[PDB]
Amino acid sequence: VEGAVKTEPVDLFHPGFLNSSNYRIPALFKTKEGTLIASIDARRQGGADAPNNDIDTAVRRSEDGGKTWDEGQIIMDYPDKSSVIDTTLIQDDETGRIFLLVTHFPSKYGFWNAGLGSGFKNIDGKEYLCLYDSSGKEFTVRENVVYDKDGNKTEYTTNALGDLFRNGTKIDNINSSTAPLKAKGTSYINLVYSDDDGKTWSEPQNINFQVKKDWMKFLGIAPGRGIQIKNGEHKGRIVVPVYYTNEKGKQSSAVIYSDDSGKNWTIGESPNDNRKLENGKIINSKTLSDDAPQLTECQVVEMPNGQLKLFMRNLSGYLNIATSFDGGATWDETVEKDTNVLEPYCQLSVINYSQKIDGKDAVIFSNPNARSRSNGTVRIGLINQVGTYENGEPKYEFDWKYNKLVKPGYYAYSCLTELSNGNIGLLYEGTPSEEMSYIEMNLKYLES
Numbered sequence: 547v548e549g550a551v552k553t554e555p556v557d558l559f560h561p562g563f564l565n566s567s568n569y570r571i572p573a574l575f576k577t578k579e580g581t582l583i584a585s586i587d588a589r590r591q592g593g594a595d596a597p598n599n600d601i602d603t604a605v606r607r608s609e610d611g612g613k614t615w616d617e618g619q620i621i622m623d624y625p626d627k628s629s630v631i632d633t634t635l636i637q638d639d640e641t642g643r644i645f646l647l648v649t650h651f652p653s654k655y656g657f658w659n660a661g662l663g664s665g666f667k668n669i670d671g672k673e674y675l676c677l678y679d680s681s682g683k684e685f686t687v688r689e690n691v692v693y694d695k696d697g698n699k700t701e702y703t704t705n706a707l708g709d710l711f712r713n714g715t716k717i718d719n720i721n722s723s724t725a726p727l728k729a730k731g732t733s734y735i736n737l738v739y740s741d742d743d744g745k746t747w748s749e750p751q752n753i754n755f756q757v758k759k760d761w762m763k764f765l766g767i768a769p770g771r772g773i774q775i776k777n778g779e780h781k782g783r784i785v786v787p788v789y790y791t792n793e794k795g796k797q798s799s800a801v802i803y804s805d806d807s808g809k810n811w812t813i814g815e816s817p818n819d820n821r822k823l824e825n826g827k828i829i830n831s832k833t834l835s836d837d838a839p840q841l842t843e844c845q846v847v848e849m850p851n852g853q854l855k856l857f858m859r860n861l862s863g864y865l866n867i868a869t870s871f872d873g874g875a876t877w878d879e880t881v882e883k884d885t886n887v888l889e890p891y892c893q894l895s896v897i898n899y900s901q902k903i904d905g906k907d908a909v910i911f912s913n914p915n916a917r918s919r920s921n922g923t924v925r926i927g928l929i930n931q932v933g934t935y936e937n938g939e940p941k942y943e944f945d946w947k948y949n950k951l952v953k954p955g956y957y958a959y960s961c962l963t964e965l966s967n968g969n970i971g972l973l974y975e976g977t978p979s980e981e982m983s984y985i986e987m988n989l990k991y992l993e994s
């Protein structure tokens with residue numbers, strides 16, 4: 547219509563950018579200062595997931611509302627087919643610190659063959675990263691010094707990038723396929739941060755010791771963004787969607803969260819914990835042994851009173867939504883299936899919108915509206931309180947009042963942001979692993 551805006555797509559990442567052949571897995575976030583940060587997997591050896599690749603994390607910034615973007619930078623890169631995969635962005639409003647988290651695998655490891663547990667061992671009240679030699683002998687890294695099983699210092703030291711030094715000379719990296727001492731072959735959650743609006747980034751901090759349980763095999767970032775809670779008793783809490791597998795390989799969603807501006811993290815329960823299924827049975831994420839109830843990648847939004855809603859990739863064919871009354875620590879037993887929203891087993895994006903639409907609080911949602919990864923559609927969901935739970939808490943559901951096709955044909959992972967001008971930015975996989983497309987839309991367009 548007149549005044550409607552939908553910009554022509556720009557290839558924000560593409561083959562050749564930063565000398566990467568392939569790209570996947572978008573994250574997009576507007577900072578407190580108004581800067582757009584876009585992160586992505588720079589998939590260097592094709593488009594496949596780890597372990598069949600060598601994947602680095604790339605970031606671009608825009609200081610003019612997404613009209614122009616910088617030359618990009620690689621902010622994490624491990625050697626020899628060790629990969630960082632699946633990024634997420636959030637910022638602490640209090641300190642201004644921006645966080646990017648990502649899943650990290652040593653060479654040869656991925657989802658399917660990840661070992662159990664955090665990869666850390668507790669020695670006298672502190673968690674230390676374990677290393678193993680080819681015989682399976684176990685060592686610990688204590689303040690970057692490698693100790694043997696009997697507590698004796700060895701000739702080895704490490705750095706935060708995993709480099710392995712013998713008497714101060716680098717010989718390998720503990721994440722490579724050739725190191726004489728290697729980290730456990732499993733998933734790790736890495737965190738980096740920026741205190742200058744995304745221009746420079748810290749080295750990765752491995753937070754597996756805080757968030758990964760002994761019985762988890764895979765634990766990964768659910769890519770996109772996090773939130774910081776605005777209302778209620780958990781105001782200020784930083785919440786980052788994740789998902790994990792149990793010993794039987796079955797997937798369950800959750801969030802990790804920090805109440806101290808990102809310094810310390812913990813993981814909450816999954817909506818699969820004490821979940822009541824349609825058949826009336828109760829399950830738990832630790833014991834889940836069936837494929838059908840799996841809950842995987844997810845994104846979280848906040849209701850008017852602070853209540854959290856976790857929107858989840860799943861196997862039902864439709865959107866699933868979980869509810870938390872305690873800031874992500876636990877979830878209500880009922881996972882809602884919203885049959886107005888197809889979910890063809892793919893990542894989705896959902897964000898809060900800052901102003902009311904048609905007199906209602908609203909969210910913006912993006913995914914492939916089909917039984918395949920196609921028909922990419924952005925929706926406006928208006929929030930309605932439809933009743934209360936037995937515990938007296940408000941019960942909220944969504945009215946998907948406006949639903950707009952934005953990408954005919956291929957559409958896979960995506961990430962939304964609200965822009966400074968009130969419009970919506972969207973970075974999406976409009977090709978399987980090549981060009982990643984950015985557009986800006988206004989509400990006039992979305993409602994048309």
Ligand SMILES: [Ca+2]
Nearest residue numbers: 600623624625
């Ligand atoms: Ca690399």
